[PDB]
Amino acid sequence: LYIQWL
């Protein structure tokens, strides 16, 4: 699982 808010 990978989440990113850039």
Add this chain to the structure above:
Amino acid sequence: LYIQWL
């Protein structure tokens, strides 16, 4: 930008 990989 928002990235999500479950």
